[PDB]
């Protein structure tokens, strides 16, 4: 099973560790190791660039994990965010702030990042001077008391989301819903996930969250036992539910004033809400490849956690100086690895297994011509390149990182 | 008072908003607005590059906010992480995982990120193949039930830290403590904080945390009422306290085996632990400048949240096309702003107030020569540059972003 093989790879090479492994570990709680944090950050950079900073109609925020409790009463989560089990059980995590543990310092950890955006809608309109159609994007931790946490990092109690609320004139919501479904689906494909392992699934009206009139899920073919498909991201039409309920509960006008047409209306909201940690899982699974056999993690070079590995042909004291000066130069621009242990052939394979797009070998000939050998991960091609031109050579091939 | 003037600027321009402002707001809980999230991320990038990816002896991780409870018993936080008030009160925030609220699903939100590093020490040594002296760095949220939260974002219950644990041979700890004090102090100065507004303060032995044998604080002259200095970052020698106590409580050997010299020892730990949100506060305060008067936020261009502003001389329908094509081009590489509202003079000043290093004006002459005017924030100089060479012109001046 590819999924089991990929999970074991992730653990073995330090993409992830079980949180508190030495004490047993919380239920499917996971830490991200050296390779994992870089891959996770690279995914965040690509989402932020595509959804926020690369666009002229979206701005970002970073709201607090712990908001005033009334936020989650007004949003309705207090009332309906529960599941029956064996009695109804609310899935929000609780904490108590301040010196007294009275039900007065009670707060909820956010189960979604969306509400921190909604309650700031008027703030952002004011300081960013935005007019619908425009969006507010955010990446951060959310918390849910999942009853059956598992499937690796697919379903955890602590996870990270990448959510954007796109505020539009109500009569335009349907075409903007289609736009963002297509835009988000294509984001995964642009970053290397095979089109055939993705699909769209529309929620039946009885499977809609309390805030949505229509949700379309982007699903990935993870390879689970039974049904191998799993929700990767939800794109929902939340209409004016969220701004209306916070205006009603807070007493603050959250409508938008269209100065041009002197009209006041509450925008509708289209919301792409992706799972950072689930996308992490999907990119690894889809990249995994068993090509005289070879294991290759064929990650988009923009996502690969290590962009290049400097590998001296041997531990020889004459190779180290030139190789270490090169690594120091490349580290100014990218995350790179240095490895002189063992047969160079096994070191190539070690890098291929974690998706490193390029290996740079400093051999004995490098001391007479001042050039090195660059190996491409997928094709295993081999080009000889001037030491002073290696950074340029890699920059052209890592553009967008 | 500069500090009050800077706080009000931050709120007014959307560097920060009070969390849940429309409902009153948690005690000194703050959201980061469009400008703030970019500045915060830019600070994180500079720390990660300087402490982690730019070095050959440090790797990163991202451990969970919520670890197994036994982590915080073993660390001693359960026993001693309390302050007397009016009775001793533990300052860790609590939550309950799982369906039962018995004192069995009880967990603590981490009051520091360090413990997630320590319990993974053997994991990281294994998968990253590191040998002391080496470090493990991390950025993430921490939580403390501060009794008197205030001073803006200086002391909050939810905040972000940038911590690195540098594991060394015990006999080398003192010189590595000096190294990291100097390295961290200089990081702030390299990013533009005036040397005279920083100082070092050594904790008296009676003011040492339970895990440290010696702590030196980097303090910044925030301008508080009374004593204007405040802790910006702590660099502590935690000796072998943390690895020893987790080995003792978990039963897992967390020593390091030096294969070369066949010696087994528990490394000492030097720990730079910075406050992301406090550094955010310090960079704003120190950049604030009142130079015919002008208000300028003189942020290092690597930190500035908006790298360039595209400003058509007017709303004229002939300027928009060329200006919008330029903004679209620059957004491929940087966060940029577009503003055609009001007198160009006031738009320059609007950008200066938030530290934008460059304004790019598309005037009527631009349509006959296909060049634009670039204005430098600090000097207000003005250079005429070919449309097709603007990205190169800015890239050279934003290197390191
Ligand atoms: N704001 C709208 C919304 O929240 N919508 S959604 O509730 O559908 O979660 C949005 C995304 O968060 C991810 N996600 C959700 N729950 C979990 C979990 N327990 N573990 C990991 N990832 C998860 C998943 O990728 C899902 O598509
Ligand atoms: N691991 C070692 C350590 O934790 N050490 S330290 O406890 O000293 O916190 C480290 C840093 O976190 C920041 N910091 C601490 N508490 C707060 C707070 N309540 N609000 C904002 N920033 C804070 C501050 O910048 C401080 O220097
Ligand atoms: Cl756009
Ligand atoms: Cl404003
Ligand atoms: Cl180094
Ligand atoms: Cl390994
Ligand atoms: Mg869903
Ligand atoms: Mg301190």
mmCIF file of N, CA, C and O in Angstrom, chain B residues 283-331:
data_model
loop_
_atom_site.group_PDB
_atom_site.id
_atom_site.type_symbol
_atom_site.label_atom_id
_atom_site.label_comp_id
_atom_site.label_asym_id
_atom_site.label_seq_id
_atom_site.Cartn_x
_atom_site.Cartn_y
_atom_site.Cartn_z
ATOM 1 N N UNK B 283 10.926 46.696 16.395
ATOM 2 C CA UNK B 283 11.288 47.199 15.072
ATOM 3 C C UNK B 283 10.433 48.393 14.673
ATOM 4 O O UNK B 283 10.923 49.328 14.030
ATOM 5 N N UNK B 284 9.143 48.366 15.011
ATOM 6 C CA UNK B 284 8.288 49.509 14.711
ATOM 7 C C UNK B 284 8.730 50.736 15.499
ATOM 8 O O UNK B 284 8.952 51.812 14.929
ATOM 9 N N UNK B 285 8.869 50.587 16.816
ATOM 10 C CA UNK B 285 9.256 51.717 17.655
ATOM 11 C C UNK B 285 10.560 52.323 17.158
ATOM 12 O O UNK B 285 10.668 53.540 16.973
ATOM 13 N N UNK B 286 11.566 51.480 16.911
ATOM 14 C CA UNK B 286 12.876 52.005 16.552
ATOM 15 C C UNK B 286 12.878 52.629 15.167
ATOM 16 O O UNK B 286 13.672 53.539 14.901
ATOM 17 N N UNK B 287 12.022 52.145 14.269
ATOM 18 C CA UNK B 287 11.961 52.704 12.928
ATOM 19 C C UNK B 287 11.234 54.038 12.886
ATOM 20 O O UNK B 287 11.472 54.826 11.964
ATOM 21 N N UNK B 288 10.365 54.315 13.859
ATOM 22 C CA UNK B 288 9.510 55.490 13.778
ATOM 23 C C UNK B 288 10.337 56.769 13.806
ATOM 24 O O UNK B 288 11.225 56.938 14.647
ATOM 25 N N UNK B 289 10.018 57.683 12.894
ATOM 26 C CA UNK B 289 10.838 58.864 12.663
ATOM 27 C C UNK B 289 9.951 60.029 12.254
ATOM 28 O O UNK B 289 9.077 59.878 11.395
ATOM 29 N N UNK B 290 10.177 61.183 12.873
ATOM 30 C CA UNK B 290 9.516 62.437 12.516
ATOM 31 C C UNK B 290 10.608 63.386 12.027
ATOM 32 O O UNK B 290 11.203 64.124 12.814
ATOM 33 N N UNK B 291 10.877 63.352 10.724
ATOM 34 C CA UNK B 291 11.929 64.174 10.134
ATOM 35 C C UNK B 291 11.584 65.658 10.224
ATOM 36 O O UNK B 291 10.642 66.131 9.585
ATOM 37 N N UNK B 292 7.672 72.151 7.279
ATOM 38 C CA UNK B 292 7.778 70.976 6.422
ATOM 39 C C UNK B 292 8.223 69.743 7.210
ATOM 40 O O UNK B 292 9.416 69.452 7.292
ATOM 41 N N UNK B 293 7.260 69.026 7.786
ATOM 42 C CA UNK B 293 7.510 67.830 8.578
ATOM 43 C C UNK B 293 7.098 66.585 7.803
ATOM 44 O O UNK B 293 6.349 66.654 6.824
ATOM 45 N N UNK B 294 7.597 65.434 8.254
ATOM 46 C CA UNK B 294 7.264 64.167 7.620
ATOM 47 C C UNK B 294 7.382 63.041 8.633
ATOM 48 O O UNK B 294 8.297 63.031 9.458
ATOM 49 N N UNK B 295 6.451 62.095 8.555
ATOM 50 C CA UNK B 295 6.470 60.891 9.374
ATOM 51 C C UNK B 295 6.939 59.728 8.507
ATOM 52 O O UNK B 295 6.326 59.437 7.474
ATOM 53 N N UNK B 296 8.023 59.075 8.918
ATOM 54 C CA UNK B 296 8.610 57.979 8.157
ATOM 55 C C UNK B 296 8.840 56.802 9.090
ATOM 56 O O UNK B 296 9.389 56.964 10.184
ATOM 57 N N UNK B 297 8.420 55.622 8.655
ATOM 58 C CA UNK B 297 8.723 54.366 9.335
ATOM 59 C C UNK B 297 9.940 53.785 8.625
ATOM 60 O O UNK B 297 9.820 53.202 7.547
ATOM 61 N N UNK B 298 11.120 53.965 9.214
ATOM 62 C CA UNK B 298 12.369 53.599 8.541
ATOM 63 C C UNK B 298 12.726 52.139 8.827
ATOM 64 O O UNK B 298 13.730 51.808 9.458
ATOM 65 N N UNK B 299 11.881 51.250 8.311
ATOM 66 C CA UNK B 299 12.117 49.819 8.441
ATOM 67 C C UNK B 299 13.145 49.344 7.424
ATOM 68 O O UNK B 299 13.128 49.762 6.262
ATOM 69 N N UNK B 300 14.033 48.460 7.863
ATOM 70 C CA UNK B 300 14.891 47.750 6.931
ATOM 71 C C UNK B 300 14.042 47.243 5.765
ATOM 72 O O UNK B 300 12.975 46.656 5.997
ATOM 73 N N UNK B 301 14.448 47.477 4.513
ATOM 74 C CA UNK B 301 13.603 47.040 3.386
ATOM 75 C C UNK B 301 13.316 45.551 3.387
ATOM 76 O O UNK B 301 12.319 45.128 2.788
ATOM 77 N N UNK B 302 14.152 44.744 4.042
ATOM 78 C CA UNK B 302 13.859 43.321 4.161
ATOM 79 C C UNK B 302 12.675 43.065 5.084
ATOM 80 O O UNK B 302 11.991 42.048 4.936
ATOM 81 N N UNK B 303 12.420 43.963 6.038
ATOM 82 C CA UNK B 303 11.284 43.820 6.944
ATOM 83 C C UNK B 303 10.027 44.532 6.456
ATOM 84 O O UNK B 303 8.916 44.119 6.810
ATOM 85 N N UNK B 304 10.169 45.594 5.671
ATOM 86 C CA UNK B 304 9.016 46.394 5.281
ATOM 87 C C UNK B 304 7.927 45.494 4.701
ATOM 88 O O UNK B 304 8.221 44.654 3.839
ATOM 89 N N UNK B 305 6.672 45.634 5.136
ATOM 90 C CA UNK B 305 5.634 44.720 4.640
ATOM 91 C C UNK B 305 5.276 44.947 3.184
ATOM 92 O O UNK B 305 4.941 43.985 2.484
ATOM 93 N N UNK B 306 5.317 46.187 2.708
ATOM 94 C CA UNK B 306 5.083 46.504 1.305
ATOM 95 C C UNK B 306 6.405 46.968 0.714
ATOM 96 O O UNK B 306 6.978 47.967 1.167
ATOM 97 N N UNK B 307 6.894 46.241 -0.292
ATOM 98 C CA UNK B 307 8.203 46.548 -0.853
ATOM 99 C C UNK B 307 8.149 47.717 -1.824
ATOM 100 O O UNK B 307 9.119 48.475 -1.925
ATOM 101 N N UNK B 308 7.043 47.882 -2.543
ATOM 102 C CA UNK B 308 6.935 48.967 -3.503
ATOM 103 C C UNK B 308 5.468 49.292 -3.721
ATOM 104 O O UNK B 308 4.606 48.414 -3.643
ATOM 105 N N UNK B 309 5.199 50.566 -3.994
ATOM 106 C CA UNK B 309 3.861 51.050 -4.300
ATOM 107 C C UNK B 309 3.842 51.604 -5.716
ATOM 108 O O UNK B 309 4.681 52.438 -6.074
ATOM 109 N N UNK B 310 2.891 51.135 -6.515
ATOM 110 C CA UNK B 310 2.666 51.651 -7.861
ATOM 111 C C UNK B 310 1.620 52.756 -7.771
ATOM 112 O O UNK B 310 0.475 52.508 -7.376
ATOM 113 N N UNK B 311 2.009 53.977 -8.134
ATOM 114 C CA UNK B 311 1.154 55.155 -7.989
ATOM 115 C C UNK B 311 1.017 55.882 -9.322
ATOM 116 O O UNK B 311 1.921 56.640 -9.709
ATOM 117 N N UNK B 312 -0.084 55.707 -10.051
ATOM 118 C CA UNK B 312 -0.305 56.561 -11.224
ATOM 119 C C UNK B 312 -0.500 58.003 -10.794
ATOM 120 O O UNK B 312 -1.135 58.285 -9.777
ATOM 121 N N UNK B 313 0.063 58.924 -11.581
ATOM 122 C CA UNK B 313 -0.009 60.337 -11.224
ATOM 123 C C UNK B 313 -1.443 60.774 -10.964
ATOM 124 O O UNK B 313 -1.686 61.645 -10.121
ATOM 125 N N UNK B 314 -2.401 60.183 -11.672
ATOM 126 C CA UNK B 314 -3.810 60.478 -11.472
ATOM 127 C C UNK B 314 -4.619 59.247 -11.856
ATOM 128 O O UNK B 314 -4.075 58.239 -12.314
ATOM 129 N N UNK B 315 -5.934 59.342 -11.679
ATOM 130 C CA UNK B 315 -6.841 58.270 -12.068
ATOM 131 C C UNK B 315 -7.076 58.213 -13.571
ATOM 132 O O UNK B 315 -7.955 57.465 -14.014
ATOM 133 N N UNK B 316 -6.310 58.971 -14.354
ATOM 134 C CA UNK B 316 -6.541 59.062 -15.789
ATOM 135 C C UNK B 316 -6.569 57.681 -16.430
ATOM 136 O O UNK B 316 -5.744 56.817 -16.124
ATOM 137 N N UNK B 317 -7.522 57.488 -17.342
ATOM 138 C CA UNK B 317 -7.724 56.179 -17.949
ATOM 139 C C UNK B 317 -6.535 55.737 -18.790
ATOM 140 O O UNK B 317 -6.422 54.548 -19.102
ATOM 141 N N UNK B 318 -5.651 56.658 -19.166
ATOM 142 C CA UNK B 318 -4.473 56.296 -19.942
ATOM 143 C C UNK B 318 -3.298 55.869 -19.072
ATOM 144 O O UNK B 318 -2.404 55.170 -19.564
ATOM 145 N N UNK B 319 -3.276 56.268 -17.798
ATOM 146 C CA UNK B 319 -2.196 55.859 -16.908
ATOM 147 C C UNK B 319 -2.444 54.470 -16.335
ATOM 148 O O UNK B 319 -1.507 53.677 -16.194
ATOM 149 N N UNK B 320 -3.699 54.163 -16.006
ATOM 150 C CA UNK B 320 -4.045 52.878 -15.402
ATOM 151 C C UNK B 320 -3.464 51.678 -16.137
ATOM 152 O O UNK B 320 -2.838 50.829 -15.484
ATOM 153 N N UNK B 321 -3.628 51.536 -17.454
ATOM 154 C CA UNK B 321 -3.124 50.321 -18.122
ATOM 155 C C UNK B 321 -1.649 50.046 -17.873
ATOM 156 O O UNK B 321 -1.290 48.936 -17.465
ATOM 157 N N UNK B 322 -0.780 51.030 -18.115
ATOM 158 C CA UNK B 322 0.650 50.802 -17.937
ATOM 159 C C UNK B 322 0.992 50.574 -16.469
ATOM 160 O O UNK B 322 1.853 49.748 -16.148
ATOM 161 N N UNK B 323 0.322 51.290 -15.564
ATOM 162 C CA UNK B 323 0.613 51.137 -14.143
ATOM 163 C C UNK B 323 0.148 49.784 -13.625
ATOM 164 O O UNK B 323 0.829 49.158 -12.807
ATOM 165 N N UNK B 324 -1.009 49.315 -14.090
ATOM 166 C CA UNK B 324 -1.522 48.040 -13.604
ATOM 167 C C UNK B 324 -0.721 46.869 -14.153
ATOM 168 O O UNK B 324 -0.531 45.869 -13.453
ATOM 169 N N UNK B 325 -0.233 46.972 -15.391
ATOM 170 C CA UNK B 325 0.648 45.932 -15.913
ATOM 171 C C UNK B 325 1.942 45.856 -15.113
ATOM 172 O O UNK B 325 2.487 44.765 -14.913
ATOM 173 N N UNK B 326 2.441 46.998 -14.640
ATOM 174 C CA UNK B 326 3.660 46.996 -13.839
ATOM 175 C C UNK B 326 3.410 46.362 -12.477
ATOM 176 O O UNK B 326 4.181 45.506 -12.028
ATOM 177 N N UNK B 327 2.326 46.762 -11.809
ATOM 178 C CA UNK B 327 1.989 46.147 -10.537
ATOM 179 C C UNK B 327 1.842 44.642 -10.643
ATOM 180 O O UNK B 327 2.316 43.900 -9.780
ATOM 181 N N UNK B 328 1.186 44.172 -11.705
ATOM 182 C CA UNK B 328 1.035 42.734 -11.898
ATOM 183 C C UNK B 328 2.392 42.058 -12.046
ATOM 184 O O UNK B 328 2.593 40.937 -11.566
ATOM 185 N N UNK B 329 3.339 42.728 -12.704
ATOM 186 C CA UNK B 329 4.672 42.157 -12.861
ATOM 187 C C UNK B 329 5.401 42.103 -11.524
ATOM 188 O O UNK B 329 5.994 41.078 -11.168
ATOM 189 N N UNK B 330 5.365 43.198 -10.764
ATOM 190 C CA UNK B 330 6.098 43.237 -9.504
ATOM 191 C C UNK B 330 5.487 42.307 -8.461
ATOM 192 O O UNK B 330 6.204 41.812 -7.585
ATOM 193 N N UNK B 331 4.175 42.059 -8.531
ATOM 194 C CA UNK B 331 3.540 41.159 -7.573
ATOM 195 C C UNK B 331 4.008 39.725 -7.729
ATOM 196 O O UNK B 331 3.796 38.914 -6.819
#
